[PDB]
């Protein structure tokens, strides 16, 4: 459903 | 904020949304 | 939103996304109130019965979409939060009074032509604005119908709602529904004979209830997207959260932190 958001964010 | 609530794109540019007269008439 | 149209560009820089680091999951909607704090329903935070109870860390904020799934390159703008204040007298239990929290950014958010705040309803404000018949304006990617087997079809947005509606008299919330109200929340929706449609939903709690100023032109946030009996249902209405009543609770915790 929701695309990948970059990963520094998804800490 | 003191620049809360006016948006850039509709009231910093003196333009106007596709429902927001409906709001104002009914204040009237 | 349910029976709303999608909203424009920009049309709710105020606007933000509460979104679950995982499993990635729309949250609650929520609403930029300065640079570093973030007004939403405390329901979306904590709701035991439910099992919710989460964390800073569990969340991030979005500021600046449109798009509900899309990662909005150079559009939108992702934060992490710092701290999560929930009212301490909201209650959970019963008939979510006090449905209320901040949260504060790590770092403060840079506003953008995407991204702007909405500013709370002073004392005058408030009394001149919220009033039976004046209608305000509710946004969210919440879900666009009542949950139910028998429904066919998305049930889910592709892009911000937008629906207004009316603010409803005491009187006619208080005896809509049985759950026991209280003067922090406000009802808003069609009436029966009005015979027309539209209302939140679930998925679009946290969002703002915002009115305009004639006296100003400005936007003020006036309620938080908190409960309600199905969606859309007939003879029913949606309850929000009385910000002005509460803004006493909302300068503290800004002003001690
Ligand atoms: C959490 C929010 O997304 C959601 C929005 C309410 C739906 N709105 C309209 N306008 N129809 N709120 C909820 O889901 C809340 C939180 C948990 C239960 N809940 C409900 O709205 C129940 N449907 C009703 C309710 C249960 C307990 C206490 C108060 C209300
Ligand atoms: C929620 O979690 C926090 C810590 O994560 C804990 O201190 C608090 O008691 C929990 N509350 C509920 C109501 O489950």
């Known amino acids: 459903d929701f695309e990948e958001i970059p990963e520094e964010y998804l800490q | ?28 | 939103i349910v029976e709303g149209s999608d909203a424009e560009i920009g049309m709710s820089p105020w606007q933000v996304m509460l979104f679950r680091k995982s499993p990635q999951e729309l949250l609650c909607g929520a609403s930029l109130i300065s640079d570093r704090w973030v007004l939403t329903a405390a329901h979306c935070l904590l709701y035991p019965p439910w099992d919710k109870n989460f964390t800073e860390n569990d969340l991030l904020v979005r500021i600046g979409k449109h798009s509900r799934t899309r990662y909005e390159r150079n559009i939108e703008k992702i934060s992490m939060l710092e701290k999560i204040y929930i009212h301490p007298r909201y209650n959970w239990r019963e008939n979510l009074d006090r449905d209320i929290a901040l949260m504060k950014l790590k770092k403060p958010v840079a506003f953008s032509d995407y991204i702007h705040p909405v500013c709370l309803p002073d004392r005058e404000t408030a009394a001149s604005l919220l009033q039976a018949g004046y209608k305000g304006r509710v946004t969210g990617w919440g879900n666009l119908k009542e949950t139910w087997t028998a429904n066919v079809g998305k049930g889910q947005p592709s892009v911000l709602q937008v629906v207004n509606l009316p603010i409803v008299e005491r009187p006619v919330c208080k005896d809509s529904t049985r759950i026991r109200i209280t003067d922090n929340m406000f009802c808003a929706g069609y009436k029966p004979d009005e015979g027309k449609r539209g209302d939140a939903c679930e998925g679009d709690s946290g969002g703002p209830f915002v009115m305009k100023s004639p006296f100003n032109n400005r936007w003020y946030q006036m309620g938080i997207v908190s409960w309600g009996e199905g969606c859309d249902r007939d003879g029913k209405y949606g309850f929000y959260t009385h910000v002005f009543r509460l803004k006493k609770w909302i300068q503290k915790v800004i002003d001690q932190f």
Do not use: H, M, N, Q
């Open chain 2, 1 to 28: 904020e003191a620049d809360c609530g006016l948006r850039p794109l509709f009231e910093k540019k003196s333009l106007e949304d596709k429902t927001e007269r409906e709001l104002l008439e009914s204040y009237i």
